[PDB]
Design a protein around this ligand. Structure first.
Ligand SMILES: Cc1cc2nc3[nH]c(=O)[nH]c(=O)c3nc2cc1C
Ligand SMILES: Cc1cc2nc3[nH]c(=O)[nH]c(=O)c3nc2cc1C
Ligand SMILES: Cc1cc2nc3[nH]c(=O)[nH]c(=O)c3nc2cc1C
Ligand SMILES: Cc1cc2nc3[nH]c(=O)[nH]c(=O)c3nc2cc1C
Ligand SMILES: Cc1cc2nc3[nH]c(=O)[nH]c(=O)c3nc2cc1C
Ligand SMILES: Cc1cc2nc3[nH]c(=O)[nH]c(=O)c3nc2cc1C
Ligand SMILES: Cc1cc2nc3[nH]c(=O)[nH]c(=O)c3nc2cc1C
Ligand SMILES: Cc1cc2nc3[nH]c(=O)[nH]c(=O)c3nc2cc1C
Ligand SMILES: Cc1cc2nc3[nH]c(=O)[nH]c(=O)c3nc2cc1C
Ligand SMILES: Cc1cc2nc3[nH]c(=O)[nH]c(=O)c3nc2cc1C
Ligand SMILES: Cc1cc2nc3[nH]c(=O)[nH]c(=O)c3nc2cc1C
Ligand SMILES: Cc1cc2nc3[nH]c(=O)[nH]c(=O)c3nc2cc1C
Ligand SMILES: [Cl-]
Ligand SMILES: [Cl-]
Ligand SMILES: [Cl-]
Ligand SMILES: [Cl-]
Ligand SMILES: [Mg+2]
Ligand SMILES: [Mg+2]
Ligand SMILES: [Mg+2]
Ligand SMILES: [Mg+2]
Ligand SMILES: [Mg+2]
Ligand SMILES: [Mg+2]
Ligand SMILES: [Mg+2]
Ligand SMILES: [Mg+2]
Ligand SMILES: [Mg+2]
Ligand SMILES: [Mg+2]
Ligand SMILES: [Mg+2]
Ligand SMILES: [Mg+2]
Ligand SMILES: [Mg+2]
Ligand SMILES: [Mg+2]
Ligand SMILES: [Mg+2]
Ligand SMILES: [Mg+2]
Ligand SMILES: [Mg+2]
Ligand SMILES: [Mg+2]
Ligand SMILES: [Mg+2]
Ligand SMILES: [Mg+2]
Ligand SMILES: [Mg+2]
Ligand SMILES: [Mg+2]
Ligand SMILES: [Mg+2]
Ligand SMILES: [Mg+2]
Ligand code: NA
Ligand code: NA
Ligand code: NA
Ligand code: NA
Lengths: 64, 64, 64, 64, 64, 64, 64, 64, 64, 64, 64, 64
């Protein structure tokens, strides 16, 4: 059985790096992370000093 | 990093109140709740005494 | 077996009340109405005296 | 010919009131507003004093 | 309030059995499981000995 | 001209059998049933003795 | 309250004419037909003498 | 950079002609119109003398 | 077994004719073409002498 | 690099078996078939002796 | 009230840079730009000297 | 007439580079490649030494 957690990563650099940021967090807290699916991308502009790229991913991990 | 939990709130009054019901529950159990996105709305009719409005939300919270 | 009818309710008050308007009509004409799923919401503005909220629902009822 | 503008209204009260807020703004600035279609709903929580309901609408107006 | 967890069940037999596999896991770990919604189906072919059917479900459970 | 009716079939056995259950009901009541399109699948768990598979289909029939 | 019926019209000429074919049938059988929304278009090729254009519409009519 | 405007054209003749009607209006008011994407089609029936075909398009134009 | 090829037909006349253009090409190169499903429509404007209607279809053909 | 082919399998038995039918055909003609994604399911009723279940899959295979 | 404009940015380098290109243009012409949502990505190949990455964004700005 | 092939490119570097990988393969094997549309993005994690970014594109090419 796989389970997914819905995470939004952030980066001041790129959408790829924002995806990595979410996956990094999943790997800190979960064993057996196997894949991630991008489900949204966006940019925060008017509440941050530098534009912040966001990539939302479903991060799948194998249970057991 | 943000994480989302998928909650369905209920209310005998309105769709807004049902959304609030889900957010209230998230705030009971989670720190740093920042926003909610409505993803579905419906009404339970034929298993309840009064119509029950349901609003499903992804509730986002900031990790750390 | 359940069947669904696709109804758009209207209200001069709210989206919840417009959903109720559709369900009320289903209950006038059908037995065993069990749930409704919201599939669209909108507002009629430029052909009515007061803004009219519309909520489109699939209204499910149990056959037999 | 109709044209649509994509507006997000806000309210501290309800999703209906947030939709009205967007339509009110369109009517301040545009003639011949005829209808609005709801395309998204959400709630701002962690940057405001009170929860703020948001309703995004395509607001249609007739040209000429 | 209901909460959903996003699980992918697997089976070497059928899509129904894969859905059951996810629900079985939810019921091992959660009280008050009430329904599941199928959101995806697929087949793993080129990393397994026998084709493996997968069914992804949102599994809803009632909180409290 | 074809018309579609939106039916949810049920089965304690499988998603295929649930689809058949809806089509069977359509064929009891309608002439010239020609095809069905699956539009949703789910499982009722926490209001039934045995898990109940549901398959929602648009069932098309030819008019005249 | 509005209700919608899901009809597929056919024509050997065009997608517009196929939409008209469905609306014509609705108007034969229903009062107060007010609008139609196109939801699908296709072409039957390998079971007919001439290509047959199909347009599926939700046809809305006002109740009462 | 391209920008899109969301226009609904109308015609008493066809969906193609309704798309053209929107593009014609864009070309009256904008330079460098480059393409249009159809996003919806429908028919107004019960507020007009003759059925009116509508085609909604995103009309793209190049900035500068 | 059916297979689909994803083709975009073009016409200076209409969306129907653009769909036909894609199907014509499929029939030049493939046996047992049975149906086509429209998946997109658009108009090329700013790289052609006359507006060019495009209709994208999945064209299904029976294998063997 | 992976490539996908869009195949509709058929079976007189089940949706799973129809998916298998498409994958079987891909494996007859292609090396390195790795996975399949279900994209549609339906039932042919009024042109066959027995109901025919159809499952449409994107079948992925690794190039080289 | 927020308003969105639908812009396609371009870059010979990356999808992130193409998103930035659209946001840069919005910021040249608009006050109070607050966020952008990615809605499409693509690559122009056969009308340019170098591949051109395109990212379409809804760019939101606060009115007043 | 345009045709599309559905390819998933891979890269250990970025989503843009993964899109390029698919387009490169199309250009090795096909004449008149004109554009690509991104349809999915994901990351392989738990079967590779380094995270592998994947970008799925429909790659369009002009026939003849
Ligand atoms: C980065 C980002 C910020 C946002 N802020 C937002 N802020 C807000 O008040 N309402 C919104 O709907 C909203 N959407 C956002 C979407 C994205 C992708
Ligand atoms: C409130 C609600 C109840 C429902 N009950 C349901 N009960 C059921 O047996 N099958 C369903 O698919 C189903 N759907 C529902 C959807 C909603 C929104
Ligand atoms: C309330 C409402 C009215 C509308 N009127 C409409 N009137 C019209 O001529 N064309 C349309 O597409 C249209 N859409 C509508 C949508 C809504 C939600
Ligand atoms: C109200 C609202 C705020 C939001 N803020 C947001 N803030 C953010 O940093 N990223 C987001 O994606 C985002 N989405 C939002 C969506 C909504 C509906
Ligand atoms: C079973 C399955 C395996 C998959 N493997 C996969 N492997 C991969 O490298 N990339 C993918 O996008 C991918 N998708 C898959 C989807 C399904 C449904
Ligand atoms: C079987 C089934 C039951 C359900 N019950 C439900 N019951 C409920 O109170 N709210 C829901 O949204 C809901 N959804 C359902 C969906 C499915 C598919
Ligand atoms: C016209 C048309 C015929 C079709 N026939 C079909 N015949 C079939 O056996 N399976 C299908 O999925 C199918 N789809 C069709 C779709 C369209 C639009
Ligand atoms: C032409 C058209 C008219 C419409 N009128 C409409 N009128 C209305 O009162 N409510 C609606 O939702 C609505 N939708 C429409 C859609 C279309 C496509
Ligand atoms: C006809 C047509 C041309 C287009 N050109 C295009 N040209 C371009 O540079 N970027 C695009 O996204 C794009 N989209 C198009 C869509 C359509 C339907
Ligand atoms: C099995 C099947 C047959 C079909 N036949 C069909 N036949 C037809 O004339 N028009 C259609 O749209 C159509 N759709 C179909 C869909 C399915 C899934
Ligand atoms: C970059 C790009 C170019 C395009 N050109 C295009 N050109 C065209 O003639 N028809 C199209 O549909 C089309 N689509 C496009 C999409 C994209 C994303
Ligand atoms: C990279 C990738 C791998 C995957 N592997 C997968 N592996 C699997 O067993 N089941 C899946 O559904 C699946 N999906 C995937 C999706 C992506 C995008
Ligand atoms: Cl828009
Ligand atoms: Cl989710
Ligand atoms: Cl329907
Ligand atoms: Cl495809
Ligand atoms: Mg930096
Ligand atoms: Mg988002
Ligand atoms: Mg009360
Ligand atoms: Mg729901
Ligand atoms: Mg009042
Ligand atoms: Mg609607
Ligand atoms: Mg207040
Ligand atoms: Mg939104
Ligand atoms: Mg076995
Ligand atoms: Mg999946
Ligand atoms: Mg049994
Ligand atoms: Mg359902
Ligand atoms: Mg003729
Ligand atoms: Mg169809
Ligand atoms: Mg005329
Ligand atoms: Mg519309
Ligand atoms: Mg001509
Ligand atoms: Mg397209
Ligand atoms: Mg048999
Ligand atoms: Mg299909
Ligand atoms: Mg360069
Ligand atoms: Mg696009
Ligand atoms: Mg490297
Ligand atoms: Mg994918
Ligand atoms: Na989730
Ligand atoms: Na817009
Ligand atoms: Na219906
Ligand atoms: Na394809």
């Amino acid at each position: 059985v796989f389970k997914k957690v819905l995470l939004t990563g952030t980066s001041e650099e790129s959408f790829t790096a924002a995806a990595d940021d979410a996956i990094d967090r999943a790997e800190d807290t979960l064993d057996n992370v196997v894949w991630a699916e991008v489900v949204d991308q966006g940019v925060e502009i008017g509440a941050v000093e530098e534009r912040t790229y966001q990539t939302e991913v479903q991060v799948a991990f194998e249970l057991d």
